[PDB]
Design a protein around this nucleic acid. Sequence first.
DNA 1: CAGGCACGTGTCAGATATATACATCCGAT
DNA 2: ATCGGATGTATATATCTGACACGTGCCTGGAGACTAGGGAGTAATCCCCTTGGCGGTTAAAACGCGGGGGACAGCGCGTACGTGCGTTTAAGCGGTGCTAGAGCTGTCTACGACCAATTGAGCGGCCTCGGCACCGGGATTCTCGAT
DNA 3: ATCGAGAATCCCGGTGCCGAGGCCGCTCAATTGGTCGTAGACAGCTCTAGCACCGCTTAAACGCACGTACGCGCTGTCCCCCGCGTTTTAACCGCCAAGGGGATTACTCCCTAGTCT
Lengths: 90, 93, 323, 97, 96, 102, 110, 80, 83
Amino acid sequence: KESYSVYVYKVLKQVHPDTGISSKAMGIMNSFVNDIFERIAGEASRLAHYNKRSTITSREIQTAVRLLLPGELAKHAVSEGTKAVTKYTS
Amino acid sequence: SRKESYSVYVYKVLKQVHPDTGISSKAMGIMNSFVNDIFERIAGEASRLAHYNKRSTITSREIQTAVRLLLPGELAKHAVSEGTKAVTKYTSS
Amino acid sequence: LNGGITDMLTELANFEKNVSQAIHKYNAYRKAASVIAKYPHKIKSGAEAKKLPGVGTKIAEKIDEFLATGKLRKLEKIRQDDTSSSINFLTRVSGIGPSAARKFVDEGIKTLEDLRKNEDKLNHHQRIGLKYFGDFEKRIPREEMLQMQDIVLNEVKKVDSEYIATVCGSFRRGAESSGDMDVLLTHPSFTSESQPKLLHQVVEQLQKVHFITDTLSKGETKFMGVCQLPSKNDEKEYPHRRIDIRLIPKDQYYCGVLYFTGSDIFNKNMRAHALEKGFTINEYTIRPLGVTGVAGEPLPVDSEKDIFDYIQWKYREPKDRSE
Amino acid sequence: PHRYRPGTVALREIRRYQKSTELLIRKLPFQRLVREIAQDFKTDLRFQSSAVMALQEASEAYLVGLFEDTNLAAIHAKRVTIMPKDIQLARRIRGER
Amino acid sequence: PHRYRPGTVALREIRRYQKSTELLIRKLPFQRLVREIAQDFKTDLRFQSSAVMALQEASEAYLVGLFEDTNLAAIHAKRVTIMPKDIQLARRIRGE
Amino acid sequence: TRSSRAGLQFPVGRVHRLLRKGNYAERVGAGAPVYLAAVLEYLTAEILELAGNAARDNKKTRIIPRHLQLAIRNDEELNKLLGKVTIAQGGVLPNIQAVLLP
Amino acid sequence: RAKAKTRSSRAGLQFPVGRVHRLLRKGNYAERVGAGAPVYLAAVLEYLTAEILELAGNAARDNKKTRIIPRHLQLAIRNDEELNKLLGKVTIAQGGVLPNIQAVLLPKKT
Amino acid sequence: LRDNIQGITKPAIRRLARRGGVKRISGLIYEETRGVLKVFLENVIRDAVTYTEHAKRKTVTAMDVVYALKRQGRTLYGFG
Amino acid sequence: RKVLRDNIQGITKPAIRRLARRGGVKRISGLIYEETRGVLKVFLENVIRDAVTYTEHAKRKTVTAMDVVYALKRQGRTLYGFG
DNA sequence: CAGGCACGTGTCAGATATATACATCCGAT
DNA sequence: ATCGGATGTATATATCTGACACGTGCCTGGAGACTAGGGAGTAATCCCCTTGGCGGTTAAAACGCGGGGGACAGCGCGTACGTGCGTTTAAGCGGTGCTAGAGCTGTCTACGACCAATTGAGCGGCCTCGGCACCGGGATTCTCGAT
DNA sequence: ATCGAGAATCCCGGTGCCGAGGCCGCTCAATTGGTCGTAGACAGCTCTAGCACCGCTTAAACGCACGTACGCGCTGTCCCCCGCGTTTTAACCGCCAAGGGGATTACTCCCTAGTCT
């Protein structure tokens, strides 16, 4: 029963409060988020394997995001992720 | 260091097939890279295919399915036949 | 009334804690035993315990099986299990616990005799706990504990007259007996925003007058050790007792005294009153709760009466802090 | 009578089919084709309806992309009418053959 | 005054460069170009020689494929000379 | 929970569980699920912003897969991130070559 | 304690089932690995390598050489119609390309 | 089941090509597009049926179809 | 320290001509050299970015060949031979 | 072991399309 | 001119949601001092592997120029492909009626995951001689100019 | 449709050369019994959704008739790149300094599952 429906709905309400999303587009977003998460996790896993390190950390996912996404999206994503992790640290 | 490769192995296969032929070092590294690439490809496909079906292990069935997936027609048919003969001879002990 | 049910719940809690690595089953069983021991009626069925909040399905079935048969098959089986019972017995030693219990039983050490024969396998804390196994399990009569308070206070004021030391706990609540000694110490020169030795002089002079005889652990703020009242040299010597001394900053000393005075049900009742009145109270400080829940800076505390005043609650004597 | 210039109603129809998001392929013939091409691999296998719909969607996307690319090739050839030479070259240059 | 007909010397060198397997690009200019592109990102980089060999011959493979597809595009237009418009066709329809 | 602690709306617990059960590495560090949650939140926020801006056009208050395909194809970088994926009943963005037009 | 015989000899293969088992273990593809999986994969690798070197050996033999170099390997891989499909996305160092000229590229003669 | 290939009709190909963005169509386009559609469909069905056979079930699933699609680069969204 | 500049012109016209002859063309239009140089520069930049990011990982200041063949494998090239 | 609770799952007024009649501009001849 | 068709507004369908209540597996356990150990970070080499000059040496790049073949327009038929109008044919839709297998749950039991000893197969040094890279001559083959 | 006169292009040995391949010593990771733990195999039970059938309705497909407009085909111009001398020049080819960093090895710090308060 894995789904990301409530979370993407919360994100949409946060960005566009007045706009609703249909069920078909909801499933498309579910598939898109699963695709991106699988891609990043696989890239991070093989990157950990090449460097002979046995654990995935914040640095390895940061590098995987740097490879996978194009330029300005990559820099925005890494900035937001570093902000989130340094918030969670404190 | 302790670098590992498929040197001894591919040389034995060649001498089994062609008794009067040698391999240059660059070509030997090429064969090594080819073997590693095919191994990684087949093992990754088998791993994914095991993960879908909620199974927690890799066995002969999904490797056979993987080599039916990546390998095309004739090559796949002969590879499946050779693999299944080999595994039957092994389990016969 | 219900002594057997409470005893069985206590035994099950002990087995869950020491054998099962299940602290939460142990806590649930102890809570059930406490709420059952306070029930002023002889239990007639597990469902009767189940109607009131507390006791769940498993404990109700176990109580029903006891009422039908007079025992629990699982409890009887685990009582005669040499490994589990040996682990449970070994966890009674101060310092020798679950990890040590499993390791010792795995290497054949199951009784106190094997522990004494294997001294080199025990650390200092485990060795001292083994040495005073009988003494530690004894309760302290209020008169002996008054005498220990007297000795501690004279030694503390001998170290420096500016020190403030308070014996908290069930004794401060007026109970006729306690299982150990709890002393809280402070000095005006030591605040939260200000010596690494202030505990040391008190500990050293308590060593000098031969009141405290063993040290289990000692740091700059917390000391746990073993003490014993001086003998008359013509009467039986007093058993060894556990003593803890906690150094707390002056701005947190009274909050610490309130925490370590208890009682526990009184602690949660006061904490819930503070929360429903807009304050958060911990062991150390008292802080406001905003309209968004954000905790503020700690408020100045100079007495227990102060803490009672902030939560608009009449100051209750520790004798009246049973719940 | 009033007739249209060749290409005019073609442009109207290209707009009306490019704006909307239909399936453009009759469901029953596609399903029959899928069942008839699947029986070669395994005899008497069942099909979920969503599987047939997914196959139709994938075929639509693949074919529409191929047609866009081969139109681009035809326009490259100083030509406006598409011929099968264009389709096979679009397939070959994309590595599919 | 014996001059070969235009195009014939083209086919016979086509035979030569399809029969042999060298690098077809000088090592030093390629290495300097690689170092320039590298220092565009970040400074103070050193390259192993195997790395720049890998870049060199991967680049040869890519350019060979691009010119093969460009030739296909040119022959499609009833033409034997490849102009850049063929290159944008190959790049566009290949999907890059 | 940690998602509130990290100031995020995607579930750090669920993505940590997936990293456990997806079998990518033998052990996973503490900040890995948090950092993935942040990245996924950013990507989803970008997609929904573009989709809502597209839905502002056509006077549609509800997101349609056609709107999502339009928003993806209009952007430059998101076009390349999702180049080899097809959106079901998404259609294509309107485009007619100049030579065809009279 | 009998005389140990390697599992590759038990299955009658040349590639090591043991090394493939080890790589499957510490490659993190699945939690558990069955017994027949490495021997099946080793047999598959045996067949693929045998095909490649047989074709490369033939390409060396009809080129009047008695040692396989990368040119022969790439010719053998790219010459076959379906073996190419397995390796259609790969480039081979010092490989070269097959000699092919389109018909219109040839002179019109006449 | 016999000539389902002719099931997809010439106006259907014409409409699909219109969505592709083309103006004029030859006569021979229809046979070539039928052939390429058949080869693409059998390429997808082979992998989908292989997945179904591995699962020991006698019905395919749309999940198998999207898996077979993702295997050969044509990723599909909106089905799981 | 010796900042390199103006090396894209180092890829000479005869080099592009030789690569084209290997490709199989008969004649070459005069202005495809600049386009080929641009095509090559963008391809090298795409590969080098991934290689440099791989080399930034593991805090290594030298770019080996194994990480760059990993970078080539990322972009659907899967180079054999080296490494 | 006991609670607390955050997702998952039915179920209905109502925003949200959605198809159907005229007026207007454009579009080709 | 001139006769007709894609967009703006009303306007009655229609319809697919979002908030609202149950249910049920997740989920954190609640406050913190130690505490004796495991991975991970840090300092100290060794050497080797890349970089930077240094001067010969010449294959290859740069350049110029005649001119010939192809890129590019332009014109002309002409047949293949758009529109347009019957008509007819099979697709959608809406029911029914079975029932094959998708999916779920409860036992076990036969595979695999660890784990000490043991050894033999594979990895580094280490020669050594032969397959093959050059290398001029001598025939062969290919190509262009006349006629 | 030929011949003839020159430029590429394979066959003759030789020459030597460096690396392919046995060979030996070493060592560490497959291999062999043994224990436990649990992951699927296998059964049985629901129940649902997928196949089959029938009728009704109507919108799209098919066939036929025209009109005409892009597609080839053929000339005609000219210009642009190719073939082939000359004239630089920068790539090779060793031949060393030299020093910076990538592996190894000993030492010390987050963390860590409890252990107890």
